[PDB]
């Protein structure tokens, strides 16, 4: 379980040197980018069942063979575990947006999921589709470009942090594929 801080500390431990100036300077850019990250995590948290519901119902609408009889969404409890799993994916992505480092997301869920879904028969392309929908939806909330919600924040550029969030979702989507 490693943040930005523990990434710098672990790398400086492998080098066995002290922390110094430039690494801390990049971490000063992290601290100065702090409140943007705080408001970003607040935006992704305050739209949870929003993103999960739209994302998974969009996944079914893209490929309707899931709700077809014999599919993996075809049972009520299977839809329940489907919604729950999408929710937990969004949860660890939110933890990775707090942390600034994807080590927590690598340790919670990303390790051992592909072989699990092979063991259960979950279609990995459909999960990558759902993670892609949560990616574009979440970045659309993080730029505040949601076409159903426009909340008040002061103006600033957050394209880099948005690319960071897209890096987490692309890490999940690359992980399941």
């Amino acid at each position: 379980m490693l943040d930005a801080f523990s990434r710098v500390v672990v790398n400086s431990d492998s080098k066995a040197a002290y922390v110094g100036g430039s690494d801390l300077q990049s971490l000063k850019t992290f601290i100065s980018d702090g409140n943007k990250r705080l408001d970003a995590v607040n935006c992704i948290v305050s739209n949870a069942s929003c993103i999960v519901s739209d994302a998974i119902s969009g996944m079914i609408c893209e490929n309707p063979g899931l709700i077809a009889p014999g599919g993996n969404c075809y049972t009520n409890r299977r839809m329940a575990a489907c919604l729950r799993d999408g929710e937990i994916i969004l949860r660890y992505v939110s933890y990775a947006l707090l942390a600034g480092d994807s080590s927590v997301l690598d340790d919670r869920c990303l390790n051992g999921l592909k072989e699990t879904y092979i063991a259960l028969g979950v279609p990995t392309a459909s999960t990558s589709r759902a993670v892609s929908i949560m990616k574009a939806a979440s970045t659309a909330f993080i730029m505040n470009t949601a076409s159903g919600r426009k909340i008040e924040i002061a103006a600033g550029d957050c394209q880099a942090l948005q690319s960071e969030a897209a890096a987490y979702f692309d890490k999940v989507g690359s992980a399941v594929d």
Partner: protein, 164 residues
């Protein structure tokens, strides 16, 4: 590795929920006390060699019987092990000082520390003499600001109270 962010992420993870506003306030306080921590880290990375030099020199200045037979740092190699150990300590004080929690200093230095010393017949009191020398000596305003100083002394105090 303990920090504000790992404790709150592990906490909301333990609840199985998304991070609420409380965790956001916690990491907000992390990015408040951050600049004082990293100031102390910059100065420690600046003058670590002199700090370790004064630490070991005062450590054998208090206890001379370490250079006695064959009980302790009696040879040049063992005293070299002394100075490199102190360096590891200041390196871990710098590491936990950057992190802001006592995580990496605990899991790298403190954990299993008691068992190793007894096995090697390493006296912990002389370590305490070294760190309390570096603790007593520092000046809050001259070298650095008082707040960073407080943070540094606190970390070093943790080392002492975890040692014996």
């Amino acid at each position: 590795m303990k920090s504000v962010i790992t404790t709150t992420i592990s906490a909301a993870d333990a609840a199985g929920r998304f991070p609420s506003s409380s965790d956001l306030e916690s990491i907000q306080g992390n990015i408040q006390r951050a600049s004082a921590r990293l100031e102390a880290a910059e100065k420690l990375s600046g003058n670590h060699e002199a700090v370790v030099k004064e630490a070991g020199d005062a450590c054998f200045a208090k206890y001379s019987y370490l250079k006695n037979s064959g009980e302790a740092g009696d040879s040049q190699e063992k005293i070299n092990k002394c100075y490199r150990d102190v360096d590891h300590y200041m390196r871990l004080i710098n590491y936990s000082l950057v992190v802001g929690g006592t995580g990496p200093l605990d899991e790298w230095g403190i954990a299993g520390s008691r068992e190793v010393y007894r096995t090697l017949n390493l006296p912990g009191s002389a370590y305490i003499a070294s760190f309390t020398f570096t603790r007593d000596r520092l000046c809050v305003p001259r070298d650095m600001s008082s707040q960073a100083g407080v943070e540094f002394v606190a970390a070093l105090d943790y080392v002492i109270n975890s040692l014996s």
